[PDB]
Design a protein around this motif. Structure first.
Motif, PDB file in Angstrom:
ATOM      1  N   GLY A 228     112.099 -25.765-117.220  1.00 37.38           N
ATOM      2  CA  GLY A 228     111.330 -24.868-116.377  1.00 37.38           C
ATOM      3  C   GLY A 228     110.130 -25.569-115.770  1.00 37.38           C
ATOM      4  N   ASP A 229     109.546 -24.956-114.747  1.00 32.29           N
ATOM      5  CA  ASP A 229     108.398 -25.536-114.058  1.00 32.29           C
ATOM      6  C   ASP A 229     107.090 -25.188-114.768  1.00 32.29           C
ATOM      7  OD1 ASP A 229     107.052 -26.967-112.069  1.00 32.29           O
ATOM      8  OD2 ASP A 229     106.769 -25.172-110.840  1.00 32.29           O
ATOM      9  N   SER A 230     106.934 -25.679-115.994  1.00 31.96           N
ATOM     10  CA  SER A 230     105.738 -25.410-116.785  1.00 31.96           C
ATOM     11  C   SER A 230     105.583 -26.434-117.899  1.00 31.96           C
ATOM     12  CB  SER A 230     105.788 -24.002-117.382  1.00 31.96           C
ATOM     13  OG  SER A 230     106.654 -23.957-118.501  1.00 31.96           O
ATOM     14  N   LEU A 231     104.349 -26.636-118.351  1.00 28.09           N
ATOM     15  CA  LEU A 231     104.069 -27.570-119.438  1.00 28.09           C
ATOM     16  C   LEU A 231     104.779 -27.165-120.726  1.00 28.09           C
ATOM     17  CD1 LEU A 231     100.269 -28.425-119.082  1.00 28.09           C
ATOM     18  CD2 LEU A 231     102.242 -29.776-118.360  1.00 28.09           C
ATOM     19  N   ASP A 232     104.799 -25.866-121.005  1.00 28.01           N
ATOM     20  CA  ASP A 232     105.473 -25.342-122.189  1.00 28.01           C
ATOM     21  C   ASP A 232     106.959 -25.677-122.173  1.00 28.01           C
ATOM     22  OD1 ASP A 232     102.978 -24.311-122.646  1.00 28.01           O
ATOM     23  OD2 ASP A 232     103.662 -22.276-123.091  1.00 28.01           O
ATOM     24  N   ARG A 257     113.594 -27.828-110.962  1.00 24.23           N
ATOM     25  CA  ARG A 257     112.632 -26.742-110.821  1.00 24.23           C
ATOM     26  C   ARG A 257     111.190 -27.232-110.755  1.00 24.23           C
ATOM     27  NH1 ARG A 257     113.694 -21.290-114.107  1.00 24.23           N
ATOM     28  NH2 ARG A 257     115.684 -20.625-113.174  1.00 24.23           N
ATOM     29  N   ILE A 258     110.928 -28.394-111.348  1.00 26.72           N
ATOM     30  CA  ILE A 258     109.579 -28.949-111.389  1.00 26.72           C
ATOM     31  C   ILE A 258     109.021 -29.136-109.982  1.00 26.72           C
ATOM     32  CG2 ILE A 258     108.126 -30.836-112.190  1.00 26.72           C
ATOM     33  CD1 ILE A 258     110.116 -31.411-114.360  1.00 26.72           C
ATOM     34  N   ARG A 259     107.884 -28.498-109.712  1.00 23.37           N
ATOM     35  CA  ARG A 259     107.308 -28.488-108.371  1.00 23.37           C
ATOM     36  C   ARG A 259     106.874 -29.886-107.949  1.00 23.37           C
ATOM     37  NH1 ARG A 259     102.261 -24.645-109.987  1.00 23.37           N
ATOM     38  NH2 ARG A 259     103.999 -23.708-111.157  1.00 23.37           N
ATOM     39  N   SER A 263     101.490 -30.153-105.300  1.00 28.63           N
ATOM     40  CA  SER A 263     101.584 -28.697-105.370  1.00 28.63           C
ATOM     41  C   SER A 263     100.401 -28.109-106.127  1.00 28.63           C
ATOM     42  CB  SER A 263     102.894 -28.266-106.039  1.00 28.63           C
ATOM     43  OG  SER A 263     104.022 -28.699-105.301  1.00 28.63           O
ATOM     44  N   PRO A 264      99.849 -26.995-105.625  1.00 33.90           N
ATOM     45  CA  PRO A 264      98.741 -26.308-106.294  1.00 33.90           C
ATOM     46  C   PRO A 264      99.140 -25.758-107.660  1.00 33.90           C
ATOM     47  CG  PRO A 264      99.628 -24.962-104.521  1.00 33.90           C
ATOM     48  CD  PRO A 264     100.239 -26.320-104.375  1.00 33.90           C
ATOM     49  N   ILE A 265      98.195 -25.757-108.594  1.00 35.31           N
ATOM     50  CA  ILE A 265      98.417 -25.199-109.920  1.00 35.31           C
ATOM     51  C   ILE A 265      97.372 -24.129-110.198  1.00 35.31           C
ATOM     52  CG2 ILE A 265      98.557 -25.668-112.387  1.00 35.31           C
ATOM     53  CD1 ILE A 265      99.257 -28.576-111.623  1.00 35.31           C
ATOM     54  N   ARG A 266      97.831 -22.961-110.645  1.00 37.72           N
ATOM     55  CA  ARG A 266      96.967 -21.798-110.850  1.00 37.72           C
ATOM     56  C   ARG A 266      96.139 -21.487-109.605  1.00 37.72           C
ATOM     57  NH1 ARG A 266      96.656 -24.427-115.709  1.00 37.72           N
ATOM     58  NH2 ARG A 266      94.750 -25.512-115.038  1.00 37.72           N
ATOM     59  N   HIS A 272      99.414 -30.751-108.833  1.00 38.77           N
ATOM     60  CA  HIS A 272     100.512 -31.429-109.509  1.00 38.77           C
ATOM     61  C   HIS A 272     100.497 -32.929-109.232  1.00 38.77           C
ATOM     62  CE1 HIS A 272     104.602 -31.994-111.125  1.00 38.77           C
ATOM     63  NE2 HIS A 272     104.429 -30.810-111.684  1.00 38.77           N
ATOM     64  N   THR A 273     100.655 -33.724-110.286  1.00 42.56           N
ATOM     65  CA  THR A 273     100.597 -35.174-110.161  1.00 42.56           C
ATOM     66  C   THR A 273     101.980 -35.801-109.990  1.00 42.56           C
ATOM     67  OG1 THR A 273     100.315 -35.144-112.575  1.00 42.56           O
ATOM     68  CG2 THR A 273      98.391 -35.688-111.242  1.00 42.56           C
ATOM     69  N   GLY A 274     103.000 -34.965-109.838  1.00 45.18           N
ATOM     70  CA  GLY A 274     104.317 -35.448-109.468  1.00 45.18           C
ATOM     71  C   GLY A 274     105.403 -35.277-110.510  1.00 45.18           C
TER      72      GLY A 274
ATOM     73  N   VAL B 246      95.681 -33.510-122.360  1.00 48.32           N
ATOM     74  CA  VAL B 246      95.427 -34.433-121.251  1.00 48.32           C
ATOM     75  C   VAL B 246      95.523 -33.687-119.924  1.00 48.32           C
ATOM     76  CG1 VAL B 246      96.235 -36.477-122.494  1.00 48.32           C
ATOM     77  CG2 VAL B 246      97.838 -35.178-121.067  1.00 48.32           C
ATOM     78  N   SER B 247      96.203 -32.543-119.934  1.00 44.79           N
ATOM     79  CA  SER B 247      96.251 -31.677-118.761  1.00 44.79           C
ATOM     80  C   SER B 247      94.895 -31.008-118.559  1.00 44.79           C
ATOM     81  CB  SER B 247      97.352 -30.624-118.897  1.00 44.79           C
ATOM     82  OG  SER B 247      96.991 -29.615-119.823  1.00 44.79           O
ATOM     83  N   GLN B 248      94.096 -30.978-119.619  1.00 46.00           N
ATOM     84  CA  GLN B 248      92.735 -30.461-119.543  1.00 46.00           C
ATOM     85  C   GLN B 248      91.725 -31.604-119.538  1.00 46.00           C
ATOM     86  OE1 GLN B 248      92.013 -27.566-122.606  1.00 46.00           O
ATOM     87  NE2 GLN B 248      93.652 -26.188-121.924  1.00 46.00           N
TER      88      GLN B 248
HETATM   89  N1  DTP Z   1      96.628 -30.520-115.565  1.00 40.80           N
HETATM   90  C1  DTP Z   1      97.810 -30.744-114.984  1.00 40.80           C
HETATM   91  N2  DTP Z   1      97.966 -31.872-114.258  1.00 40.80           N
HETATM   92  C2  DTP Z   1      99.141 -32.097-113.664  1.00 40.80           C
HETATM   93  N3  DTP Z   1     100.243 -31.343-113.672  1.00 40.80           N
HETATM   94  C3  DTP Z   1     100.058 -30.231-114.393  1.00 40.80           C
HETATM   95  C4  DTP Z   1      98.906 -29.866-115.071  1.00 40.80           C
HETATM   96  N4  DTP Z   1      99.076 -28.644-115.704  1.00 40.80           N
HETATM   97  C5  DTP Z   1     100.302 -28.301-115.392  1.00 40.80           C
HETATM   98  N5  DTP Z   1     100.952 -29.208-114.598  1.00 40.80           N
HETATM   99  C6  DTP Z   1     102.288 -29.078-114.029  1.00 40.80           C
HETATM  100  C7  DTP Z   1     103.371 -28.679-115.018  1.00 40.80           C
HETATM  101  C8  DTP Z   1     104.308 -27.824-114.178  1.00 40.80           C
HETATM  102  O1  DTP Z   1     105.259 -28.630-113.482  1.00 40.80           O
HETATM  103  C9  DTP Z   1     103.361 -27.159-113.184  1.00 40.80           C
HETATM  104  C10 DTP Z   1     102.871 -25.790-113.583  1.00 40.80           C
HETATM  105  O2  DTP Z   1     102.395 -25.808-114.944  1.00 40.80           O
HETATM  106  P1  DTP Z   1     102.152 -24.506-115.821  1.00 40.80           P
HETATM  107  O3  DTP Z   1     102.070 -24.911-117.289  1.00 40.80           O
HETATM  108  O4  DTP Z   1     103.178 -23.454-115.638  1.00 40.80           O
HETATM  109  O5  DTP Z   1     100.728 -23.939-115.391  1.00 40.80           O
HETATM  110  P2  DTP Z   1     100.214 -22.444-115.193  1.00 40.80           P
HETATM  111  O6  DTP Z   1     101.196 -21.492-115.762  1.00 40.80           O
HETATM  112  O7  DTP Z   1      98.859 -22.289-115.884  1.00 40.80           O
HETATM  113  O8  DTP Z   1     100.052 -22.204-113.626  1.00 40.80           O
HETATM  114  P3  DTP Z   1     101.128 -21.911-112.489  1.00 40.80           P
HETATM  115  O9  DTP Z   1     100.934 -20.445-112.111  1.00 40.80           O
HETATM  116  O10 DTP Z   1     100.737 -22.775-111.294  1.00 40.80           O
HETATM  117  O11 DTP Z   1     102.507 -22.208-112.991  1.00 40.80           O
HETATM  118  O12 DTP Z   1     102.241 -28.059-113.039  1.00 40.80           O
END
Ligand code: DTP
Ligand code: DTP
Ligand code: DTP
Ligand code: DTP
Ligand code: MG
Ligand code: MG
Ligand code: MG
Ligand code: MG
Lengths: 733, 734
Positions: A228-232, A257-259, A263-266, A272-274, B246-248
């Motif tokens: 999924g497109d998330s850190l979790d 799925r990874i953006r 790409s903007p986050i939150r 996004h760093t790629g 590291v994401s933070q």
């Molecule tokens: N600090 C970060 N630096 C680089 N990439 C990150 C970072 N945090 C998350 N990502 C990447 C992982 C995923 O591919 C994508 C979204 O991550 P995610 O864990 O779902 O964040 P989020 O749920 O708080 O916000 P969003 O609404 O943008 O999904 O960005």
């Protein structure tokens, strides 16, 4: 006057007749073999006090070296001598012990699982012993015996000591898989399955061969994980990979799925760093349980062609470039659909998106082609949506260029995978494949490694040996045995991850393929390249799928359909013969020989035990046991030479003596058109996919290099005939 | 003149050089040895018809900034004030800032400030807080400080670059947030006192607090300590934990010493271990998972014991030679050493290498019980059934220092010093690693899952006293009260993405308060690093620091209760740092204790401490620039530092160069490392955790222009001799 040292350590006068006696025994029924020639090569190596075991290994190697096109039967001479040696190593004598005595001893040594003694009485073991024909060991080829000794036979890895023989392996694999059957049918199933495998009708995978009867429960060799497109989910995917590669399973990773990078986050709190840094994390996960790069962890990563970073992803494997933009130790599958090919043919452009910027576009890509084209055109004209535009020809050429140079950039036609599929794309779309691209199963991303709502796809494999069957109607019996044996394994094996168990218990998916297809064609006087095998192929794989479906349907009558059967197209009265690529009608006119309409109603009424049944995997190791040609691939030569730990192993294609002119070797072929046609015809009936290779000889081309036009030509040819995936590209040297 | 300028609103008017002169006069007030005419000379030539007023202003800023030198250091304030002026207009449209309440209300609506500010304070309280503020304190920043404010700290829109606030609003609201939960009888009194402390540069706050506290964010953790267990579940958990932090933007310290060696049996022999290195690589990609390119990004230091079976392969993980298969270059490493290891070196004997999976109790004893370690170590050395390898101690130490010298990022942790002289009871909560920069020393417990509640991840909230801004050491009483209480409140304020980390923070409430401007502090008192003249002053100074810190945390415990896991500390059993320091310090320092520690001992016995740790000497490169302080305890490399950046070259003069240029001892003016190391050891007598101690070498000062191994080992042993816990960077002059 010379003396030899016997196995017990005693010494005695050397007797060349004893060597002659053993060689005569091994030479029975063989043609064009010379006992005297083997003796000549062996005798010179004899010295005072030489061990009899060393004497025997000397004549084995001598016989093995004489394996050739002129005298292929040396493969059985050397094999029988090797079997003889293994008997002595394991039993201290030629004749094996009683089955019950053997099992008891091995359980005490901790080599067999105790449950064999709990599930079967001594009398039942006595009865199973009467099924066994130890003389079937005399039917192995030399390469087969080497794989047995090396990979399959239960042994002590520390000392190399062999503890069992081949027929004990076969009968106990059978006894284990059918241990939970009621006593009114159990031993009947055990005998019938034992006969099937020991006579090479059914080919079993390596983890089953080596594992089933031992204390282990690790039998999954193939795993499909969607990220999924998330850190979790990225962490969950990574953990799942580590868990399964530690069990030596091959991995298919969907990371599409990874953006994209930037790409903007939150909403913009971060950017996004790629995709690539995460790919690297997946790679180190895959290689986490590997020393060096000889083999170890293997994975294929999948992404859509229209992904915003696709130009960076396509070049991840080539040697040149810095480490920062390369992830070389994984393979990659590019996901393509009709619209992409359309843009290519019309010489138009392809627009690149990040899946996070195109709502519904990623889902429609797999499930709804009509909806995909609507959204795709909608988003192409929207200026507010971030995008990049490339020439379709430029994009495909880049893909095919990296596929040509590495051989490991794969193609998945995702629309073919869902329009012609056992699954309802609206409920359970196929959005990826496995390592070797024959598996096509539904998945759901995990938000944690122990997530109970994620789905990891597993598949239990096996293959019919087409060279060992006399009539296609034999497949009825064989399908019943294969399907029932593998379905039992699903309840037998262990699952290290809940999301994996959920998929296996939910869909009970099986992947049964074929081996010896090339030998099968030569037997019937057909070839790959001229189209003469089209109808025979159509007939053959109709029977395979029909009898597989019939077997799984009857198994559903008896034990109930799989819990998630309602998510199949089968559940709605749809069969493979309804949804195949209609372009196949132009290359095959072979009629259906079986009552599919009767099957259709029986499936609607009772369902299937298994959501999928057929998949054409590659088989190099498994195939050697039967001395079969590898999967559906044509052999590269009449005799294969493989260097190894124990020396050079020679292997002759089955019945070269009578079919040397009938065989069509790989590099004797004009192109890929004939083979790809056959693959498409197979895919008409196959539930999942096929590990189809493309092959090119630069010598057959002007200037000695394969032009891009030919590469794209074959690519479009595959798509034309409904081919779902493209595996290796082999380039001759 | 025919020339016209363009004003901010878009209007144009005839150029008036007096207006430039007027602004320059304002910025030059109180400044000495600066020339308005020279700034005008350099600026005027760049003027063209229709030039923007903002561009005119940036021209004179750059002109003043370029004139920052030893001969005229006050240009650092001229340029700074011009920059402040510019930032005022960018944020407020005029020079004078709006009323605080009006400002807060506007920013909350824009979503730049957290709403809880308006919920926790009434309008009258905001009006009252406005009377605390002195916006003229913006006039006291140096140029480098202002650029850092503009660049990293001031609340802004990253897309457009728009600046929304000014420094005093930053300061006052950091104070308001951290003390928001305090009772109304003391709350605003605490707010004023803390605001005064930071805006007049007594207390230096870290980057995540400066930029974060008052905004909607809750991510303030910048250093994380994770211990990895010898299992796939733990390795996975460690990996996931790393990725989250590291994401933070947090720096990571990873203990991977528990991972068994290559070739080790698994489950009795069902499989065999494929080595630590492939797992290290996985940790690296986890650290770099949220990084584009190699510039800065994710940062981590990985720790392992010197006696690990793979140590010869681990030590060379950073150097350029070798294939990619046996290299993990983008992390730093800390080699863990104890007395027995040094003993084998001195006696020229051998060191036996083990896998921790084959030596029961040895790994635990390595940190907690030195006597038990020696018993087990010799016991297992004689056992032939136990897998081991033998190397000459000299050869192993030389290999380590070899890689330390060439890369500069192979660190040393003296784990015995870290547990015998520690705020923690080693039998219950041993210190088994450090952080990225080797100043943090906290207990940890491995995780079996990313959300495991029984694991413990160590966190530490940082800050520093500015030694250059205090007049006498008794000021530290007040400052410790403010610092400890502000950081302790932050613990309850910030967020915790991982349970194991929340447990450690809430359990031990650990703090890490250090110093900046130490070199300037020495120069002020006419002391130096290398000759031993600073030994007693350092002893006096750092006794005062630790005493007042402990006193503040002790009183905070009276008021609000000791930390939940206080009973795991040595403090809880009536033990003080002055009891357990390395006794070799008595030979280099005879300064007596000036404070009543025995009264403190009893008060801690009765009421306890709010925080398990209080002091740690971190490096401060970014934080220090706000105060225009010398970095941490490190000596300056020059009187004026030239640093190239995106916004141009930033020049920064050491504090009071005008009067103290002869009093300073520059880094490369030093004979060796002995003087510095002695000072660090004396500091460590009172410091709860550790110190980011550097070793420095000038090849020019050595025969054949190469630093001999003998010197490297000598300095290493000197550090150990005086109780130094860790060794950070090795700097080599070029
Ligand atoms: N600090 C970060 N630096 C680089 N990439 C990150 C970072 N945090 C998350 N990502 C990447 C992982 C995923 O591919 C994508 C979204 O991550 P995610 O864990 O779902 O964040 P989020 O749920 O708080 O916000 P969003 O609404 O943008 O999904 O960005
Ligand atoms: N006396 C002999 N002189 C020469 N070759 C011999 C002799 N005895 C056995 N061999 C050869 C025959 C085979 O090629 C090889 C292995 O035979 P094998 O019967 O297993 O050995 P062995 O007789 O020492 O043990 P065992 O007690 O099991 O019969 O040794
Ligand atoms: N007419 C002028 N001729 C020459 N220099 C000028 C002129 N007006 C302003 N300057 C100088 C003084 C300052 O350093 C800078 C402009 O400062 P500033 O007062 O903020 O701009 P401004 O007067 O155009 O707008 P504002 O109405 O915000 O004051 O340029
Ligand atoms: N298949 C594997 N290949 C390489 N290393 C592995 C493999 N499986 C585990 N490891 C590593 C991870 C740990 O450092 C160590 C074994 O730990 P763990 O994962 O907990 O296994 P285990 O608990 O089943 O067996 P053990 O009793 O030996 O610890 O070896
Ligand atoms: Mg014999
Ligand atoms: Mg998200
Ligand atoms: Mg003005
Ligand atoms: Mg374990």
């Amino acid at each position: 006057n010379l003396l030899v040292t016997k196995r017990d350590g005693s010494t005695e006068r050397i007797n060349l007749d004893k060597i002659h006696r053993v060689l005569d025994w091994a030479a029975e029924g063989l043609h064009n073999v010379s006992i005297s020639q083997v003796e000549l090569r062996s005798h010179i190596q004899f010295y005072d006090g030489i061990k009899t075991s060393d004497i025997h290994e000397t004549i084995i190697k001598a016989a093995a070296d004489l394996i050739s096109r002129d005298a292929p039967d040396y493969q059985y001479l050397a094999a029988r001598l090797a079997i003889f040696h293994l008997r002595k190593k394991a039993y201290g004598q030629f004749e094996p012990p009683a089955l019950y005595d053997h099992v008891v001893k091995m359980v005490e040594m901790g080599k067999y699982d105790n449950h064999l003694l709990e599930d079967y009485t001594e009398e039942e073991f006595k009865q199973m012993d009467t099924f066994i024909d130890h003389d079937r060991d005399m039917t192995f080829s030399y390469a087969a015996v080497k794989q047995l000794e090396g990979k399959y036979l239960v042994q002590n890895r520390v000392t190399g000591e062999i503890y069992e023989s081949a027929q004990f392996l076969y009968i106990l694999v059978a006894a284990c898989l059918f241990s939970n059957y009621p006593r009114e049918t159990r031993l009947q199933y055990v005998k019938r399955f034992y006969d099937a495998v020991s006579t090479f009708k059914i080919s079993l995978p390596t983890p089953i061969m080596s594992g089933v009867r031992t204390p282990t429960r690790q039998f999954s060799s193939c795993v499909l994980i969607e990220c999924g497109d998330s850190l979790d989910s990225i962490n969950a995917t990574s953990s799942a990979i580590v868990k399964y590669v530690s069990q030596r399973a091959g991995i298919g990773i969907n990371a599409g799925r990874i953006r994209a990078l930037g790409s903007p986050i939150r909403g913009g709190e971060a950017f996004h760093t790629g995709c690539i840094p995460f790919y690297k994390h997946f790679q180190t996960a895959v290689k986490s349980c590997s020393q060096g790069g000889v083999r170890g962890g293997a994975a294929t990563l999948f992404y859509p062609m229209w992904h915003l970073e696709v130009e960076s992803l396509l070049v991840l494997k080539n040697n040149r470039g810095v480490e920062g933009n390369r992830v070389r130790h994984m393979d990659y599958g590019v996901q393509i659909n009709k619209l992409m090919y359309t843009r290519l043919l019309k010489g138009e452009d392809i627009t690149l998106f990040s899946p996070s910027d195109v709502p519904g576009l990623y889902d429609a890509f797999f499930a709804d082609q009509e909806e995909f084209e609507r959204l795709y055109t909608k988003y192409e004209k929207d200026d507010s949506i971030r995008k990049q535009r490339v020439k379709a020809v430029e994009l495909f050429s880049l893909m095919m260029q990296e596929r040509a140079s590495t051989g490991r950039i794969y193609i998945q036609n995702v629309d073919h995978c869902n329009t012609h599929s056992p699954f309802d794309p609206a409920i359970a779309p196929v959005r990826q494949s496995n390592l070797c691209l024959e598996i096509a199963l539904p998945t759901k991303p995990l938000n944690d490694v122990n997530d109970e709502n994620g789905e990891i796809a597993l598949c239990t494999l096996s293959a019919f040996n087409l060279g060992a069957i006399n009539n296609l109607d034999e497949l009825e019996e064989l399908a019943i045995l294969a399907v029932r044996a593998l379905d039992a394994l699903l309840d037998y094996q262990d699952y290290p991850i809940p999301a994996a168990k959920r998929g296996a218990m939910g869909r009970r998916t099986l992947g049964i393929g074929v081996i010896n297809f090339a030998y099968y064609l030569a037997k019937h006087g057909k070839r790959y390249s001229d189209g003469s095998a089209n109808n025979l192929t159509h007939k053959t794989f109709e029977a395979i799928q029909y009898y597989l479906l019939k077997a799984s349907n009857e198994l559903a009558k008896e034990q109930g359909a799989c819990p998630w059967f309602n998510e199949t197209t089968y559940a709605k009265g749809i069969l493979p013969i309804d949804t195949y690529k209609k372009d196949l009608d132009t290359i095959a006119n072979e009629p259906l020989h079986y009552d599919w309409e009767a099957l259709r109603e029986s499936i609607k009424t009772h369902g299937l035990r298994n959501s999928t049944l057929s998949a054409l995997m590659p088989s190099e190791t498994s195939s050697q046991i039967s001395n079969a040609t590898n999967g559906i691939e044509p052999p590269r030569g009449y005799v294969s030479i493989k260097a190894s730990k124990d020396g050079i192993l020679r292997q002759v294609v089955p019945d070269y003596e009578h079919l040397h002119d009938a065989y069509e070797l790989l590099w004797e072929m004009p192109g890929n058109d004939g083979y790809l046609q056959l693959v498409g015809i197979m895919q008409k009936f196959i539930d999942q996919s096929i590990s189809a290779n493309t092959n090119y000889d630069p010598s057959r081309f002007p200037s000695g290099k394969v032009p891009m036009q030919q590469l794209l030509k074959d690519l479009l040819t595959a798509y034309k005939f409904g081919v779902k995936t493209l595996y290796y590209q082999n380039t001759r040297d």
